[PDB]
Design a protein around this ligand. Structure first.
Ligand code: ZPR
Ligand code: CA
Lengths: 6, 686
């Protein structure tokens, strides 16, 4: 549940 | 460089070897001297970072490349579907609920409406009937979590409040009457919480007062009959397996525990995949470092039989029972996934689907689900949720959702896997990503990434910032699968831990030597990065071969290998690292321990022109996992040994700390680290 693949 | 005090009277005797700890006072995060240290370092960092004029151009490109919708892998409970959603730049993903795979979604919990979306959802669990959703909310910055429960039908909360939870999931009994969970006392416990009651009434199932450092995971079989308590020591890939037959309780859980102790030791890892009655199928590393599936009847627990044997080559990473009577086995073959479909009963191969460079994960199907969903990401594939209907079209993987990165042509770039020799001969897989048709003329800036421990497999997943590096800095990216990871099974992990930790650093160094030699780049134009245990990685390599690197970025890494075990949860890292309360082990550690190995390279013969690369030490001021003292002490040491202890030091490259998981917070860190990198490698924007 990472918010964005930054 | 700000002045930093040295306590010259702190010395420890480790088996006759004296070790000074000048910066011992930085181990207290609440002293004002320590806060001042932080403020002074922050003043220096910021001063330097303004000079890095590409930080603002990185920030917008990352932001533009991240701004795309992302549906997560859907899972089913009863006849409802649940998944995570982010429209592109939301701080945290949003849990949504749907009646049908392509019907109207409904927000179920939106963490962005709480503390600015500072933290997102870490624990989340929907009941079998789909009427309840138990999730974990953080209180402040701290590790601790409160469990609350929402009704899905109308999004109203139950009064139920469960405190003192960290990493426990909520595991629902099929009667929908409550769930198992694993809290700590106001010594982790296994407990059962009936819906509608106070936490004080929760049933105790297991505690071990004699082994406080043991911790727990639990599970409930797909038929609902068996509750499985797993017990783990440290970060070993090894666990116990206790089983409780819930159908044999005379008064349900209200009675109360008498576990069948199937595995009562830490020799091997055991994960339950399926069961037919008392006949269980486990995944295990028992006599099989690359893992395998075995079968055992709990009514005759001594007799274990292989069901799918260990592969001579490939790691069996995970396994899932699907479609009543099949297994999907996710293999990692040369750090590339391979999906096999098999018969659950016979273990016979049916279908074998190799996967492109990248990663598949998040397979959440359960035994009664006939449609399987999984997520595929890659360096140049932002994220695809594929679906496989095993009933009606078992062979074709159809695309269910597909993320698109705006204004990015992946056909400009490519990704190859090549294998490189390490000091002791061993071959090391690496992934090299870069623009098509480039000349291997040694000119390109290069970013290498690795981790190197705890059986973690490093997969070439999607990073937007990395595209920006590739496109707008003409960069070459390398992900390095060094030893200590679990990519080639348990022997791969054991060849880079404890007494053999050094091999890990040697593997990374070799990957850099490969990229210098093949014409991808050159010494001093290479940037290394890694977090946590991969911060340790970075720190160790630049101590041993600072000549190879132009830039280095260690994120909340472990730097004092002598004392790491004394702080928060560092004691669970002694399986990988050793512990400096034991001479043999002390001797591994002292050789590579970052803060104790900072030496001036220009004082070595034939090496006068070498300096440490530009170093950014990224860390929080108050981290509960890897205590920041590590990063501070290292920063303190480097700055001393290489800069403030000399009048006019050859160390011109800067040594800073960046001091601070929400999306924009994350883009800021990454844009900073990348701009710093651009300035350090003397690399222009394109
Ligand atoms: C990052 O590399 C740090 C430093 C070394 C290992 N590590 C971790 O992040 C720890 C150990 C491996 C992953 N990890 C972790 O999440 O464990 C914490 C924990 C697990 C179970 C119960 C209680 C705490
Ligand atoms: Ca430079």
């Amino acid at each position: 549940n990472a918010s964005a693949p930054v | 460089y700000p002045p930093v005090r040295r306590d010259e009277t702190v010395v420890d005797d480790y088996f006759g070897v004296k070790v000074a700890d000048p910066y011992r006072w930085l181990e207290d995060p609440n002293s004002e001297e320590t806060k001042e240290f932080v403020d002074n370092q922050e003043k220096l960092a910021n001063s330097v970072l303004e000079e890095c004029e590409l930080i603002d151009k990185f920030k917008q490109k990352i932001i533009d490349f991240v701004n795309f919708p992302r549906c997560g892998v859907p899972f089913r409970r009863a006849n409802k579907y649940f998944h995570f959603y982010n429209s592109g730049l939301q701080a945290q993903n949003v849990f949504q609920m749907q009646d049908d795979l392509d019907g109207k979604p409904e927000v179920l919990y939106d963490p962005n409406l709480r503390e600015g979306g500072r933290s997102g959802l870490s624990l989340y669990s929907v009941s079998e009937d789909a009427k309840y959703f138990a999730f974990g909310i953080h209180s402040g910055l701290t590790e601790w979590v409160t469990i609350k429960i929402l009704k899905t039908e109308d999004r109203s909360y139950l009064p139920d409040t469960l405190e003192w939870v960290k990493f426990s999931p909520a595991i629902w009994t099929h009667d929908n009457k409550g769930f198992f969970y694993c809290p700590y006392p106001p010594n982790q416990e296994a407990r059962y919480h009936f819906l509608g009651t106070d936490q004080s009434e929760d049933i105790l199932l297991w505690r071990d007062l004699e082994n406080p450092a043991h911790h727990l995971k639990c599970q409930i079989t797909d038929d609902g009959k068996y509750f499985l308590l797993y017990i783990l020591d440290g970060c070993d890939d090894a666990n116990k397996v206790y089983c409780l037959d819930l159908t044999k309780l005379p008064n349900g859980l209200e009675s109360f525990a008498p576990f069948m102790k199937l595995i009562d030791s830490f020799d091997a890892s055991y994960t339950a995949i399926a069961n037919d009655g008392s006949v269980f199928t486990f995944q295990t590393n028992k006599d099989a470092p690359r893992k395998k599936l075995v079968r055992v009847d709990l009514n005759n627990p001594s007799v274990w039989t292989d069901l799918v044997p260990e592969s001579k080559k490939d790691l069996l990473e995970s396994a899932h029972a699907v479609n009543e009577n099949q297994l999907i086995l996710r293999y990692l073959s040369d750090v590339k996934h391979v999906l096999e479909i098999r018969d659950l009963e016979s273990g016979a191969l049916q279908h074998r689907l190799p996967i492109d460079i990248g990663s598949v994960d998040g397979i959440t199907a359960r035994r009664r689900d006939s449609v399987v969903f999984f997520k595929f990401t890659s360096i140049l594939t932002p994220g695809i949720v594929y679906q496989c209907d095993l009933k009606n079209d078992p062979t074709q993987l159809k695309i269910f959702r597909e993320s698109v990165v705006p204004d990015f042509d992946r056909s400009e770039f490519e990704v190859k896997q090549v294998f490189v020799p390490s000091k002791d001969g061993t071959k090391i897989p690496i992934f090299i990503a870069a623009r098509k048709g480039i000349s291997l003329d040694g000119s390109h800036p290069c970013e290498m990434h690795g981790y190197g421990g705890f059986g973690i497999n490093m997969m070439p997943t999607f990073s937007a910032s990395r595209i920006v590096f590739l496109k707008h800095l003409g960069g070459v990216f390398c992900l390095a699968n060094i030893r200590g990871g679990g990519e080639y099974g348990e022997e791969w992990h054991k060849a880079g831990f404890r007494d053999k930790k050094q091999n890990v650093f040697d593997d990374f160094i070799s990957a850099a030597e490969y990229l210098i030699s093949s014409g991808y780049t050159k010494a001093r134009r290479v940037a290394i990065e890694g977090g946590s245990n991969g911060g340790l990685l970075v720190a160790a390599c630049i101590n041993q071969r600072p000549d190879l690197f132009g830039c280095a970025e260690a994120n909340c890494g472990v730097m004092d290998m002598l004392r790491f075990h004394k702080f928060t949860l560092g004691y669970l890292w002694t399986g990988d690292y050793g512990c400096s309360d034991k001479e043999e082990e002390f001797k591994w550690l002292i050789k590579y321990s970052p803060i104790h190995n900072v030496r001036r390279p220009w004082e070595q013969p034939g090496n006068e022109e070498t300096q440490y690369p530009a170093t950014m030490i990224l860390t929080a001021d108050h981290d509960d996992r890897v205590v920041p003292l590590h990063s501070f002490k290292l920063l303190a040491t480097m700055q001393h040994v290489l800069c403030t202890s000399l009048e006019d030091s050859p160390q011109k490259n800067p040594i800073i700390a960046r001091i601070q998981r929400a999306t924009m917070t994350q883009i800021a860190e990454v844009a900073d680290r990348y701009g710093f990198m651009a300035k350090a490698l003397e690399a222009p924007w394109i």
